Design an enzyme around this catalytic site. Sequence first.
Site, mmCIF file in Angstrom:
data_model
loop_
_atom_site.group_PDB
_atom_site.id
_atom_site.type_symbol
_atom_site.label_atom_id
_atom_site.label_comp_id
_atom_site.label_asym_id
_atom_site.label_seq_id
_atom_site.Cartn_x
_atom_site.Cartn_y
_atom_site.Cartn_z
ATOM 1 N N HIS A 1 47.128 31.170 15.314
ATOM 2 C CA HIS A 1 46.696 30.452 16.519
ATOM 3 C C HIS A 1 45.535 29.493 16.288
ATOM 4 O O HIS A 1 45.279 28.603 17.105
ATOM 5 C CB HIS A 1 46.417 31.410 17.696
ATOM 6 C CG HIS A 1 45.024 31.967 17.742
ATOM 7 N ND1 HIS A 1 44.752 33.303 17.539
ATOM 8 C CD2 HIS A 1 43.839 31.389 18.059
ATOM 9 C CE1 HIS A 1 43.466 33.526 17.732
ATOM 10 N NE2 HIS A 1 42.888 32.381 18.050
ATOM 11 N N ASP B 1 50.388 36.743 14.879
ATOM 12 C CA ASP B 1 49.217 35.890 14.716
ATOM 13 C C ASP B 1 48.592 36.116 13.341
ATOM 14 O O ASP B 1 47.582 36.807 13.206
ATOM 15 C CB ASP B 1 48.213 36.198 15.826
ATOM 16 C CG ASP B 1 47.233 35.072 16.048
ATOM 17 O OD1 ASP B 1 47.345 34.034 15.363
ATOM 18 O OD2 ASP B 1 46.352 35.225 16.917
ATOM 19 N N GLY C 1 35.877 32.499 18.930
ATOM 20 C CA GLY C 1 35.190 32.039 17.736
ATOM 21 C C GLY C 1 35.278 33.036 16.593
ATOM 22 O O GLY C 1 35.039 32.681 15.438
ATOM 23 N N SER D 1 38.059 34.686 16.035
ATOM 24 C CA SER D 1 39.475 34.666 15.662
ATOM 25 C C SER D 1 39.692 34.455 14.171
ATOM 26 O O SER D 1 38.984 33.678 13.534
ATOM 27 C CB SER D 1 40.211 33.571 16.441
ATOM 28 O OG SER D 1 40.287 33.883 17.818
HETATM 29 C C1 LIG Z 1 36.433 33.942 25.984
HETATM 30 C C2 LIG Z 1 37.829 34.426 25.516
HETATM 31 C C3 LIG Z 1 38.802 34.492 26.723
HETATM 32 C C4 LIG Z 1 40.173 35.027 26.246
HETATM 33 S S1 LIG Z 1 41.428 35.232 27.457
HETATM 34 O O1 LIG Z 1 41.803 33.883 28.121
HETATM 35 O O2 LIG Z 1 40.954 36.312 28.471
HETATM 36 N N1 LIG Z 1 42.748 35.942 26.690
HETATM 37 C C5 LIG Z 1 43.597 35.080 25.830
HETATM 38 C C6 LIG Z 1 45.010 35.663 26.117
HETATM 39 O O3 LIG Z 1 45.977 35.222 25.159
HETATM 40 C C7 LIG Z 1 43.232 35.048 24.407
HETATM 41 O O4 LIG Z 1 42.799 36.095 23.912
HETATM 42 N N2 LIG Z 1 43.339 33.973 23.653
HETATM 43 C C8 LIG Z 1 43.033 33.885 22.273
HETATM 44 C C9 LIG Z 1 43.399 32.461 21.780
HETATM 45 C C10 LIG Z 1 41.604 34.130 22.046
HETATM 46 O O5 LIG Z 1 40.788 33.636 22.836
HETATM 47 N N3 LIG Z 1 41.207 34.854 21.031
HETATM 48 C C11 LIG Z 1 39.846 35.079 20.728
HETATM 49 C C12 LIG Z 1 39.400 36.430 21.154
HETATM 50 C C13 LIG Z 1 39.091 37.423 20.206
HETATM 51 C C14 LIG Z 1 38.674 38.706 20.616
HETATM 52 C C15 LIG Z 1 38.523 39.035 21.979
HETATM 53 C C16 LIG Z 1 38.119 40.328 22.391
HETATM 54 N N4 LIG Z 1 37.811 41.306 21.513
HETATM 55 N N5 LIG Z 1 38.003 40.739 23.678
HETATM 56 C C17 LIG Z 1 38.797 38.014 22.921
HETATM 57 C C18 LIG Z 1 39.277 36.753 22.518
#
Ligand SMILES: CCCCS(=O)(=O)N[C@H](CO)C(=O)N[C@@H](C)C(=O)NCc1ccc(C(=N)N)cc1
Length: 247
Positions: A46, A97, A196, A198
């Site tokens: 991603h 992913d 960030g 990720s």
């Molecule tokens: C600030 C982050 C908000 C994330 S969200 O919109 O609630 N969820 C989406 C659903 O697919 C999402 O997770 N998108 C991906 C790409 C992402 O942002 N990944 C980064 C991420 C990594 C870890 C976590 C966590 N441990 N909660 C949360 C987000």
Amino acid sequence: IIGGEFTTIENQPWFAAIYRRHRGGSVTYVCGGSLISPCWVISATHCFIDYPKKEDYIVYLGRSRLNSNTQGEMKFEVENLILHKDYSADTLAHHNDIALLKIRSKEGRCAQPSRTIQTISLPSMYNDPQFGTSCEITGFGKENSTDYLYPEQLKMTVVKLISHRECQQPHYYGSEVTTKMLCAADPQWKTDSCQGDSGGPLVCSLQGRMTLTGIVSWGRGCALKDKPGVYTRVSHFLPWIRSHTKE
Ligand SMILES: CCCCS(=O)(=O)N[C@H](CO)C(=O)N[C@@H](C)C(=O)NCc1ccc(C(=N)N)cc1
């Protein structure tokens, strides 16, 4: 990383910082990664799916700070960018992913091991730590959900592995979480990975050996009660990794 503490690359030698070269001249941080072999870094698909051009990425090893040089750091170009063909994103879940980046320096060489640059071991076939086991995550991601900037220093924290049964509960993630994913969180819901982080590693001590158990992938918000971080289960992707890293 929400909460936790600041660390140095000496304590996370396998950590890789991935940046993207911009159309003007500026460079911005994209995602974390892990060095699994001298020439290979593993991350999340991603992170690159929208800009699959290998020439626009830069990989740093032995780096402790976001926008400044660290003694002993090494810069690399991306020779091959391999994304998982079955990657897809649903309402919350991000499937398959996982990504591989073959690196090479300007001189055409791979990484040279040092005190600040080392590889991390991969898991064995379907051999994951027991649920309830403590593991660590590292990254340059957000410290607070309300932040728009990333911390200048690398951070790390410890979270616990949650069973598929618990994570599949209605108030958690329901059927969105699959067996190819792993849930991990702080029992107090105070610390967690965030935007960030990720592509970064979820490392667990398995039989006295540091193992790359998961890759930071997704989650609802950051450090929210009953909403654990979800990681790509590395042990279920060994065949895919082996086939794409050979030749
Ligand atoms: C600030 C982050 C908000 C994330 S969200 O919109 O609630 N969820 C989406 C659903 O697919 C999402 O997770 N998108 C991906 C790409 C992402 O942002 N990944 C980064 C991420 C990594 C870890 C976590 C966590 N441990 N909660 C949360 C987000």
